[PDB]
Design a protein around this ligand. Structure first.
Ligand SMILES: Nc1ncnc2c1ncn2[C@H]1C[C@H](O)[C@@H](COP(=O)(O)O)O1
Ligand SMILES: Nc1ncnc2c1ncn2[C@H]1C[C@H](O)[C@@H](COP(=O)(O)O)O1
Ligand SMILES: Nc1ncnc2c1ncn2[C@H]1C[C@H](O)[C@@H](COP(=O)(O)O)O1
Ligand SMILES: Nc1ncnc2c1ncn2[C@H]1C[C@H](O)[C@@H](COP(=O)(O)O)O1
Ligand SMILES: [Fe+3]
Ligand SMILES: [Fe+3]
Ligand code: NI
Ligand code: NI
Lengths: 335, 329
């Protein structure tokens, strides 16, 4: 459950348990992976803000009512009220997180200072050239995707990992290729492979719907056996299924992931393609931004190595009177 | 972030992100409020021009190296180079902006024409008696503080608003008076209040340091409880602190500001003392200056109502060749 209640503010990100969101009033959704939507369902009855692709997927697959889903266009600043009359406001800018379709970071600006919240993301130098991040503003808290914050874990770039996958498939001209994925993500990798090997990617109807939003080449189909590359759920890649698949057609299987996965069959390949920043990329990202502090988004994973990258700490800003009133609840008063 | 890159020139004002300032070479700081120093810290390593009081404050609180700070005396014309071959120059005159300690307007003159850049300012008729503005020169672009440029927002003069505050404090002789302020500014109001009520103003050590530069009466102290008027950060004025303060001493709180703030406690008062020209003041200012063009400095806020006061436009002046080489990236 990798979401956050931002302290001293009415802001929640990827956090949907109202029982525990005592003072939260403004709700944000970075992307549609299940660990960022725990407790989010058709019963949701509060305004939430997200990217247009996330807004489409959220209504489509979790049946949150459209009236509560406020799509904000990525890369445009938006003013949002922090009290009942918009006396106090903040600016939020969504920025591409380069993690999966719809994934964004949130730059929050208001009485509380400047907060960058990465959500899940994969850093690239182009990120630091975003206009919203090139104005010299000091970031006070950086909420960081620390999924791969392990100095022992080295990863190639996505481009290099994709190259390794191309090299491997070239050695298997007569093989079907199972690509084991999560429900959302890596569609751009599927497109690169379909173009390289002049073949169709076979997908489920749910993933074909999503691909329509992405502006990718016309290389995807639901038609069974229409091409050599088959997008499958990552859990389907196992020894037992290799033995079933091979009764119809020679098959190899690829798990593009940073996770450490023992290969149980000679034709199952684990290749460290990743949609999260590597440790070295996190170090570059934080050293460039020099925030006053770093707070991990992923509670169960390590976060460290940025002590010498921080700017001098700043005192906790006072909450404006009007926002205090907005965050209050009659349930926390007597009578 | 209310700074500007003046187009067709190497001039920047209150604009410090170098990566955006590829062709800017002359940097100016109108005053030390944080929305005018976004990106300016001890990493700054270019010449920087400002008023003497701004220079003292910039080094003290942002740790810009003295070697980069070029204080220019207010009200004096200064010739500044626009290249590195001793050819093209401009003249800059700093004029009192009447906004806060150290605040200035910049009159720029050169190949680009005559540009008046107000920064933040509060207009007064004395402003127009400035010798630099009484020579009949035609201002081509007036960069204007449009914070309060709303025909519906009517404001008293600072003197009238101060009088309202005096009237309020007279009703509570047994009370401490919290005055919620920004980090810089309104020290003259604190002085007037201490003299009116024959008491001391309790300040932070930082603000006491600044007061030493202003030539104000010996009415300020950092000694706790040493007087009835307490300068506090404006964010501290809130319902919760009224309940805390009154457990020690009866307390009134005053927010001197033009912002529309709802009072959450009977004894919190918002009084429209402002350090920004009102709309009616902006109109008299522009109407007296008749610039070719008015460009707002506060892009997040509305600006208009001046087309009746503009002079006929002029074509974009040519950049001299030597200055292009200076600006080259
Ligand atoms: N702690 C945990 N438990 C179970 N399933 C999880 C967990 N974290 C992520 N996931 C699943 C959910 C997503 O569909 C997929 C990609 O998550 P990503 O975070 O982008 O790598 O991984
Ligand atoms: N041992 C283990 N158990 C459960 N989840 C794990 C484990 N190791 C990594 N992960 C998760 C972490 C990320 O959510 C995903 C890798 O993201 P990717 O884009 O695939 O690199 O796999
Ligand atoms: N857009 C914005 N965001 C956050 N804080 C701001 C902003 N504008 C001004 N300020 C703060 C900064 C100054 O210290 C104070 C007086 O600004 P003055 O411009 O003289 O009225 O108000
Ligand atoms: N709605 C709103 N939100 C945030 N800031 C605002 C708003 N309205 C005005 N202001 C700011 C603008 C100036 O910085 C300050 C007034 O300057 P002073 O000298 O205090 O009159 O208050
Ligand atoms: Fe996640
Ligand atoms: Fe300002
Ligand atoms: Ni994710
Ligand atoms: Ni100001």
């Amino acid at each position: 459950m990798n979401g956050v209640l931002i302290p001293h503010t009415p802001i929640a990100v990827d956090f949907w348990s109202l029982r525990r969101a005592g003072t939260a009033r403004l709700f944000f959704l970075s992307h549609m992976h299940s660990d960022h939507t725990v407790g989010l369902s058709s019963t949701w009855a509060r305004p939430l803000y997200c990217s247009p692709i996330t807004a489409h997927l959220l209504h489509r697959h979790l049946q949150v009512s459209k009236q509560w889903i406020q799509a904000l266009e990525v890369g445009e600043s938006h003013v949002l009220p922090l009290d009942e009359i918009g006396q106090e406001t903040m600016t939020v800018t969504l920025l591409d997180a380069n993690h999966c379709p719809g994934s964004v970071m949130f730059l929050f600006e208001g009485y509380f200072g400047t907060i960058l919240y990465t959500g899940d993301f994969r850093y690239t130098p182009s990120m630091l050239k975003e206009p919203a991040l090139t104005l010299g503003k000091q970031i006070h808290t950086l909420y960081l995707d620390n999924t791969n914050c392990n100095p022992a874990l080295v990863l190639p770039s996505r481009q290099e990992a994709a190259h390794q996958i191309v090299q491997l498939i070239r050695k298997h001209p007569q093989h079907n290729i199972k690509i084991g994925l999560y429900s959302l993500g890596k569609e751009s990798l599927l497109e690169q492979l379909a173009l390289e090997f002049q073949t169709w990617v076979v997908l489920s109807p749910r993933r074909l719907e999503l691909v329509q939003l992405l502006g990718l080449a016309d290389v995807f189909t639901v038609e069974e056996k229409a091409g050599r590359i088959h997008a499958v759920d990552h859990m389907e890649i196992c020894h037992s299924n290799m033995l079933r698949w091979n009764q119809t057609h020679p098959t190899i299987a690829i798990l593009p992931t940073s996770r450490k996965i023992h290969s149980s069959h000679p034709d199952i390949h684990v290749i460290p393609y990743s949609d999260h920043s590597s440790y070295s990329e996190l170090r570059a990202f934080v050293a460039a931004l020099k925030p006053c502090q770093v707070v991990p988004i992923v509670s169960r994973r390590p976060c460290g190595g940025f002590q010498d990258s921080l700017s001098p700490r700043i005192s906790v800003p006072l909450i404006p009177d009007s926002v205090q009133q907005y965050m209050s609840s009659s349930s926390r008063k007597p009578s």
